[PDB]
Amino acid sequence: TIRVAINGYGRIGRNTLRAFYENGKKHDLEIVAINDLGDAKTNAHLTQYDTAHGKFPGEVSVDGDYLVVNGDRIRVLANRNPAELPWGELGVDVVMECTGFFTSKEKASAHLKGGAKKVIISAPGGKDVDATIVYGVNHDVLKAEHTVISNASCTTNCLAPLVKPLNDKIGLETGLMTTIHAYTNDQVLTDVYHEDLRRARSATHSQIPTKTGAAAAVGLVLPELNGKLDGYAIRVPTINVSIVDLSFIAKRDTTAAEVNAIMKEASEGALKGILGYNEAPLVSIDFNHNPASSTFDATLTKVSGRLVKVSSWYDNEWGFSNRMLDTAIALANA
Amino acid sequence: TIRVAINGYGRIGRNTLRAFYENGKKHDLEIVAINDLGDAKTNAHLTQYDTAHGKFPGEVSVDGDYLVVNGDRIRVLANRNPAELPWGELGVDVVMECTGFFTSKEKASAHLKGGAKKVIISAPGGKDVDATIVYGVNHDVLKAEHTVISNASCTTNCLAPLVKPLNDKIGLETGLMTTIHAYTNDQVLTDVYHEDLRRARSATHSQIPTKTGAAAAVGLVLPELNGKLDGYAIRVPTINVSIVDLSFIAKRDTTAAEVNAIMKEASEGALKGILGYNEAPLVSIDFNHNPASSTFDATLTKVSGRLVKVSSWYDNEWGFSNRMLDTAIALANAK
Amino acid sequence: TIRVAINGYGRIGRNTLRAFYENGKKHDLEIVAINDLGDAKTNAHLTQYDTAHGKFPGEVSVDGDYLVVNGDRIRVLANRNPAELPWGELGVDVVMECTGFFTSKEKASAHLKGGAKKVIISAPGGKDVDATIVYGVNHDVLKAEHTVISNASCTTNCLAPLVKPLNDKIGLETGLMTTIHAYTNDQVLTDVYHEDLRRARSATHSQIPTKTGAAAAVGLVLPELNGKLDGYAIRVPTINVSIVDLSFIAKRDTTAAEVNAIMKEASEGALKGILGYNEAPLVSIDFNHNPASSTFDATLTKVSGRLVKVSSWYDNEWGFSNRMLDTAIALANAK
Amino acid sequence: TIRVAINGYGRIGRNTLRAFYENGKKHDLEIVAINDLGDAKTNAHLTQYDTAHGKFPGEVSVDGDYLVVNGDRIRVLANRNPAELPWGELGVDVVMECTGFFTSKEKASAHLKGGAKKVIISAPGGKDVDATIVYGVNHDVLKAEHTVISNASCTTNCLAPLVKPLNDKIGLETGLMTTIHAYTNDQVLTDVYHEDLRRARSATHSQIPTKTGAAAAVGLVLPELNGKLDGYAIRVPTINVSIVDLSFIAKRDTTAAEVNAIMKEASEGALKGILGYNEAPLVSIDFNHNPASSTFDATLTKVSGRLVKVSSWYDNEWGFSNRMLDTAIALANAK
Numbered sequence A: 001t002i003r004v005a006i007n008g009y010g011r012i013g014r015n016t017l018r019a020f021y022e023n024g025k026k027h028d029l030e031i032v033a034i035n036d037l038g039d040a041k042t043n044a045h046l047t048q049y050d051t052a053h054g055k056f057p058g059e060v061s062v063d064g065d066y067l068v069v070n071g072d073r074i075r076v077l078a079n080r081n082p083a084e085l086p087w088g089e090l091g092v093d094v095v096m097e098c099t100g101f102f103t104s105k106e107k108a109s110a111h112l113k114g115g116a117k118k119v120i121i122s123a124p125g126g127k128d129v130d131a132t133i134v135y136g137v138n139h140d141v142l143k144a145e146h147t148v149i150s151n152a153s154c155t156t157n158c159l160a161p162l163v164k165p166l167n168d169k170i171g172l173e174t175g176l177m178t179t180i181h182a183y184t185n186d187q188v189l190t191d192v193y194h195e196d197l198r199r200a201r202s203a204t205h206s207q208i209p210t211k212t213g214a215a216a217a218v219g220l221v222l223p224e225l226n227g228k229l230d231g232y233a234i235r236v237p238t239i240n241v242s243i244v245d246l247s248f249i250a251k252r253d254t255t256a257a258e259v260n261a262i263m264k265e266a267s268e269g270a271l272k273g274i275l276g277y278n279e280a281p282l283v284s285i286d287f288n289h290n291p292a293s294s295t296f297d298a299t300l301t302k303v304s305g306r307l308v309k310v311s312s313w314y315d316n317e318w319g320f321s322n323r324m325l326d327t328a329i330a331l332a333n334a
Numbered sequence B, C, D: 001t002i003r004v005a006i007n008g009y010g011r012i013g014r015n016t017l018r019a020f021y022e023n024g025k026k027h028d029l030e031i032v033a034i035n036d037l038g039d040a041k042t043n044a045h046l047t048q049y050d051t052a053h054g055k056f057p058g059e060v061s062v063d064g065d066y067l068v069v070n071g072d073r074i075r076v077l078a079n080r081n082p083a084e085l086p087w088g089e090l091g092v093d094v095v096m097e098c099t100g101f102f103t104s105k106e107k108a109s110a111h112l113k114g115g116a117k118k119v120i121i122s123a124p125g126g127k128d129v130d131a132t133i134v135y136g137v138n139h140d141v142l143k144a145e146h147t148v149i150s151n152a153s154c155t156t157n158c159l160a161p162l163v164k165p166l167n168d169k170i171g172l173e174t175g176l177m178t179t180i181h182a183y184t185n186d187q188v189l190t191d192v193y194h195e196d197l198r199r200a201r202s203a204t205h206s207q208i209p210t211k212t213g214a215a216a217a218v219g220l221v222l223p224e225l226n227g228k229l230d231g232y233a234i235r236v237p238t239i240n241v242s243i244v245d246l247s248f249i250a251k252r253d254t255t256a257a258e259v260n261a262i263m264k265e266a267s268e269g270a271l272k273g274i275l276g277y278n279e280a281p282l283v284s285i286d287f288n289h290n291p292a293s294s295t296f297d298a299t300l301t302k303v304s305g306r307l308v309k310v311s312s313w314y315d316n317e318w319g320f321s322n323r324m325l326d327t328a329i330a331l332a333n334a335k
């Protein structure tokens, strides 16, 4: 049994906890601490009530310094410097770093200085990171000597399972991705200063093109694809749920019907759970609270000669959060 | 001066009228008639005030059975049937069908019976019309013989100019399109009956995949790309402005900087005014009320081997409405 | 046991069905028919998936001209003239009229012509209807003879339970209401023709003021407040859930604590189930899928001298829909 | 001619700068400097483009240590300590203090030490400020000796002109306001930590109640109303524009007709420019970019006995920014 701490009890921080309980505690861990900026009442409140995901099924409360979820008691800290955190005393095996501010191995290591054994960055890591994992694809690579890994991005986790079966059973020369993405909290309501002049613009009124390493990053979860994929994102005005739209050059001739079939039985077999399959006439909100990393949408496949276009829907919060649990385990028992 | 009317006075209707006045009436034209069925107080108010395009910078009022727009008297009508409108009494050279309900050719020639010498449809027409035109790309294929033509879709109007100089100087084996598109009035506010099951879902809260013929219909304006382009739309929660995202296989080797150069040149050349060129870090709302049919975005270009991704922004209402005016001219003045 | 048909299977129609199944079919009725504009395939799809309320918890399938929900077979019709429609064949006890087009005894009686024995309008009716009902407050006025009734509006069902206990224990001279109301399907996505000049404007970008009879109507269900209340609505950019903001002159001195204590007592007693009570720091979306007709928000209470301001949240779809079932059971079993 | 510096170039700063230029530089001042910690290029871009207010109708560019707007060159500084700023070297008569973190006379006086003669806070001030001003209402109170003043808040600037005529000519016992307010950048996109638990909730999907001291603050500028008004805000999903909804007990009997005449008279004389008057059937976005502090809406007035409800629209950004210019002038010229 593994002992976990969450640093950053925000969209990904909390939804990892919510997914831990909504699953039924199958994952052989315990969440023992939780770090954010606010008091325990604040965290208790945001755990019980959510816009995107509704009210939390079970029972939540506070006990002075402790958040209590379905009987389990969880300490609530509010120290912004992770170096001075009591991870040693709590005897934490894995700190989930979900604040967005410590994404390099340099910065994330504060948790090792604090006294935690390992750390999972809820995001793409710095070049210096021990590893970058997309669970269900390359989680094998993990060794006990890995102390500071990355869990990739929500996009990367969606793209990897879409492309692997099509590269294996058809072959891809080159591919270009557009992901159309729900807005996130790094964006703004009405135009204000931001490091990126596009993310400086109102997220609720525009399509905002934005950079993302997701396509290239797949390159180094499936090394055989290294340097063969690029892409970018368009943020649109929705609260949650994204889609990946991949165009690629097939090595040989193919058809829509066949592309779909490869993806179908990929979802029914070796990628089951991770990769979903859809033929129904659904829209983005129908995948809200779907725990798949990637739900491929057969209804949108289009093939024109050697050029193939495929799409997959992903709950960028819920999909990614369920994988944070999976990858926490894998990392602890390497 | 070409004497012009409009039938259907909806978003396309009103914005075509507004387009004309906002330009400075620099089109050799005069809008002499408007044939919605809702009353005149209501249409004046919707001309004056608009959420997406803001307040009309001009004077709007009603004098009985008439509309006054910066001094000019627009005859309001109310006939359901196009065969018996007065048109030819008032010398109507070109009519504009913007309700849609009457899209095909035999229904459309009813305006000719009513007196009109020509007719422009503000939508894709049935496979049986004198032309489908994308102004600045193929409008030169017009003649005096032609009567009931099509001005295409907003999306086809954005795709054609995007693709031409790329096919012409690089060559395009095949392409697939996704247009990320603002919601429109056929959609719904909260899930309720619709003949399409995706469009029956709240427009304000989802990305909604929808079918569009606009990629195939590039064939009809650029014959050399018959069968080479396909695609669809994803409807998103914006009130206006849309982007065409195009992936295509190039016949030869290339770069992003070259694709960009070719497009800049084409924006300063034949398609000047119709096709724009952006290098600035802008978002969709920046292209709201931009009269271009297509503004290519050099910042978004990606080339990976022989696969090329280019994208162009379009105000799905405004650009198209400014082309309708361009088209109505070129229609009349062909032989 | 009473046999019910839903006419108009939209926001209130489907959610009345959904409500009926999510409450474990405790109501002594069976839903035997749905009438709308599409086929069973469309009605089943919209029953199964929803933006505002998420995925239906049970099982929905299709079998020919029958929609099947949790094993119950429900016949799907698509005729937009109630006169026709086989209510006699199906032996319907109560039609729930939820299309928005038959909101008077005269108009809604077309269902009687079609074979049904009694009708509930899902909205304010004319003065001509036999009763206007807010369940929890005046349903005891229902009589065996009454054939066509009105269930009032969402707003009236929220306001009556708010105002009643305060007028009984404190006293109310006059009162004025504003309801900040989610948009509904009678509004538009981008500016376009409508009988109402403000509702002709995008629901997604504006606060839009509109009329409501709810204040006066609280007189009809609580005669002691005849002519004392007035008010209106402001439609805002949200997909569901609304609030009533009532201001009134108290007839004696009171405090915020007393006002809250009174309402807490009423929610716990005679109006239990119809009226909830909140003192948590919540926002509109937290009341989504709350079946109460009115959830008093004690945290928002304001008294200054004799002027009192109180607020109650309501799920305009879910509250009203649960009440439609309750009122059906009261209507048929009356006497 | 007054030399004005802007400390803190967020939305308030930028919008104030734009209103100056968009009004044709009619105000007898010049903007000679801006102090902000962001980099110039970003601040230039955000001056040129805005979602809520659209594209600045002039030219904006950067040239070294200078922001350039319609030919005028504006020195850009980036120092967090205003004691060390060159205001005295620059001859700055009035700093507009727009940062948030200098709302006390004690703190603001750092600008005095830096060389500025006067400071106007774009926000309610601490107890120690020389005055609080709603332009058109109490700017007469400004005196030579005042060096650090408040311009109050956007809501107070809406409410004071609304209630002043009514109190003068009818009389107000007490009053309670709800202000239905656009969201601001102090809120969140999707639920996340905030010091207030309601603002921790998505602004884009809910009605969100929040405290404001803006009703009680009307006592600062209309001492006759001191202690008589209170209220709160409901934040709704719109990017800009808000409405003040005031309920009050009148001291004598009046009519809706009398209330409106009183406001029209006020708008055409004493408060001309600051208070507008609408009888048109308009919605919130039609007031976007309206520079009035308060536009009273005659169509919304209700009276029932001695209870009056009156509503006024305000662009909670543009109104306030225009008034900052007005007040800056009066402050520098005081006595």
Ligand SMILES: NC(=O)c1ccc[n+]([C@@H]2O[C@H](COP(=O)([O-])OP(=O)(O)OC[C@H]3O[C@@H](n4cnc5c(N)ncnc54)[C@H](O)[C@@H]3O)[C@@H](O)[C@H]2O)c1
Residues within 6 Å of the ligand: A007, A008, A009, A010, A011, A012, A013, A035, A036, A037, A079, A080, A081, A098, A099, A100, A101, A122, A123, A153, A154, A184, A185, A186, A316, A317, A320, D192, D193
């Ligand atoms: N939201 C998504 O779709 C998504 C998906 C995959 C990965 N991610 C990644 O996860 C990370 C966080 O994303 P998010 O959406 O949860 O952001 P968020 O803003 O919603 O949550 C971040 C939380 O961390 C807290 N925090 C900030 N500084 C802190 C500090 N110094 N110490 C402790 N806590 C601090 C904040 O108060 C907040 O509660 C980012 O790196 C992001 O790229 C996001």
Ligand SMILES: NC(=O)c1ccc[n+]([C@@H]2O[C@H](COP(=O)([O-])OP(=O)(O)OC[C@H]3O[C@@H](n4cnc5c(N)ncnc54)[C@H](O)[C@@H]3O)[C@@H](O)[C@H]2O)c1
Residues within 6 Å of the ligand: B008, B009, B010, B011, B012, B013, B035, B036, B037, B038, B098, B099, B100, B101, B122, B123, B153, B154, B184, B185, B186, B316, B317, B320, C191, C192, C193
């Ligand atoms: N809006 C766009 O982005 C755009 C772009 C390209 C093509 N189009 C096409 O243009 C057409 C119109 O679209 P819109 O957005 O303007 O529609 P709209 O719903 O916003 O406006 C249509 C108007 O026509 C009126 N109308 C309906 N039936 C009528 C009838 N029987 N007789 C007279 N008037 C009638 C309505 O009252 C309304 O005022 C559509 O068919 C669409 O496919 C629209």
Ligand SMILES: NC(=O)c1ccc[n+]([C@@H]2O[C@H](COP(=O)([O-])OP(=O)(O)OC[C@H]3O[C@@H](n4cnc5c(N)ncnc54)[C@H](O)[C@@H]3O)[C@@H](O)[C@H]2O)c1
Residues within 6 Å of the ligand: B192, B193, C007, C008, C009, C010, C011, C012, C013, C035, C036, C037, C079, C080, C081, C098, C099, C100, C101, C122, C123, C153, C154, C184, C185, C186, C316, C317, C320
């Ligand atoms: N939405 C609310 O919050 C709310 C609350 C209380 C009461 N109501 C009232 O209930 C009624 C329904 O409102 P709604 O929100 O469900 O509207 P809606 O548009 O969602 O529903 C109308 C339904 O009726 C169908 N329809 C239209 N014409 C028909 C015909 N003649 N025959 C059969 N079906 C037809 C439509 O396809 C649709 O499914 C209205 O009178 C409304 O005022 C609405």
